[PDB]
Design an enzyme around this catalytic site. Structure first.
Site, PDB file in Angstrom:
ATOM      1  N   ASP A 251       0.833  -1.200   0.000  1.00  0.00           N
ATOM      2  CA  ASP A 251       0.000   0.000   0.000  1.00  0.00           C
ATOM      3  C   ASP A 251       0.873   1.257   0.000  1.00  0.00           C
ATOM      4  OD1 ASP A 251      -1.920   1.967   0.278  1.00  0.00           O
ATOM      5  OD2 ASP A 251      -2.468   1.397   2.354  1.00  0.00           O
TER       6      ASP A 251
ATOM      7  N   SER B 138      -0.598  15.880 -11.774  1.00  0.00           N
ATOM      8  CA  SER B 138      -0.837  15.538 -13.163  1.00  0.00           C
ATOM      9  C   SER B 138      -1.078  16.804 -13.981  1.00  0.00           C
ATOM     10  CB  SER B 138      -2.035  14.585 -13.265  1.00  0.00           C
ATOM     11  OG  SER B 138      -2.428  14.409 -14.615  1.00  0.00           O
TER      12      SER B 138
END
Length: 330
Positions: free
Chosen positions: A35, A199
């Site tokens: 994770d 992004s």
């Protein structure tokens, strides 16, 4: 040193991925959920409340000659899906794919919430975010990657998650045969303890690319892709019959639909998520309403590049002094 381990989807939807991990002496092998969105290595154990164990493999520290109680240390964690777990702490030897760390903090669950009990395929979590998020008290503990870093050939790990297929986590090296083209690296902020990046924009299907900054985290422990409401609305508007359902808890769409791809920007580069990756199947067994793999982050407080996005790429988690993230097509 290096390590290399195969990671396998737990179910036909790629809801999560498990990777075998050797703990203790002699080795006890548990299948853990790696994770990158948390920083605790915790396991079902001989200390876990018996009614909360249902099929998982447990770690028994009393059977490991290298286990040592970390005196006074406790842990307690809550995840974005509302699940939780807590317990005490041992140090022991932990190996992943041939890479061995001695003295790793292994957090033994005394309690787990129902969703963990109900998932017999996941024996615990191995956190790979920054150690500043580790929950052990009163002395915070380091992640497996942080402890291994100095010994690695290169201070990196990579995630190569499969679509309905096995993939690989590598530690300490870049497998240049595992991706196409080049790797585009992008800056990381560690201020929230996550692999947090920005992004450069998105496209829906064959549509034009929209340049817009989207701050979010690379999180292998989250199934879906969570993005701003404006972006998610633009995506689902291209799917006839798609709607946001408050009763179901997100966007749903007709199972008979063919979904458009979704492209996200990494610098000047582009990662394309095929439409099929966005189909998470019937909301309930036999239903013709299917659950969408792209959902709004508006209620989370952070955008999350989960497995839906990451499994479309070869992803480099660069733990150099100034950390960065790398993405390549594959």
């Amino acid at each position: 040193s290096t390590g290399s381990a195969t990671t396998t989807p737990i179910d036909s939807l790629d809801d999560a991925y498990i990777t075998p991990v050797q703990i203790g002496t002699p080795a006890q092998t548990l299948n853990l959920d790696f994770d990158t969105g948390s920083s605790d290595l915790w396991v079902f154990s001989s200390e876990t409340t018996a009614s909360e164990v249902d099929g998982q493999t447990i770690y028994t520290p009393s059977k490991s000659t290298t286990a040592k109680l970390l005196s006074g240390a406790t842990w307690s964690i809550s995840y974005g899906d509302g699940s939780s777990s807590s317990g005490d702490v041992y140090t022991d030897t932990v190996s992943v794919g041939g890479l061995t760390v001695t003295g790793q903090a292994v957090e033994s669950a005394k309690k787990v919430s129902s969703s963990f009990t109900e998932d017999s395929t996941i024996d615990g979590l191995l956190g790979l975010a920054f150690s500043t998020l580790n929950t052990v008290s009163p002395t915070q503990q380091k992640t497996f990657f942080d402890n291994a870093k100095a010994s690695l050939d290169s201070p990196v790990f990579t995630a190569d998650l499969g679509y309905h297929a096995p993939g690989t986590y590598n530690f300490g090296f870049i497998d240049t045969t595992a991706y196409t083209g080049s790797i585009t690296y992008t800056a990381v902020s560690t201020k929230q303890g996550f692999w947090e990046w920005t992004s450069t924009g998105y496209a829906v299907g064959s549509g034009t690319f929209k340049s817009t900054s989207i701050d979010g985290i690379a999180d292998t422990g989250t199934t879906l892709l969570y993005l701003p409401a404006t972006v998610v609305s633009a995506y689902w508007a291209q799917v006839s019959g798609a709607k946001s359902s408050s009763s179901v808890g997100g966007y749903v769409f007709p199972c008979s639909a063919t979904l458009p791809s979704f492209t996200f920007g990494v610098g000047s580069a582009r990662i394309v998520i095929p439409g099929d990756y966005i189909d998470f199947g019937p909301i309930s067994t036999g239903s013709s309403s299917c659950f969408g793999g792209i959902q709004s982050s508006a209620g989370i407080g952070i955008n999350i590049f989960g497995d839906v996005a990451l499994k479309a790429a070869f992803v480099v988690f660069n733990g150099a002094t100034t950390p960065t993230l790398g993405f390549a097509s594959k």
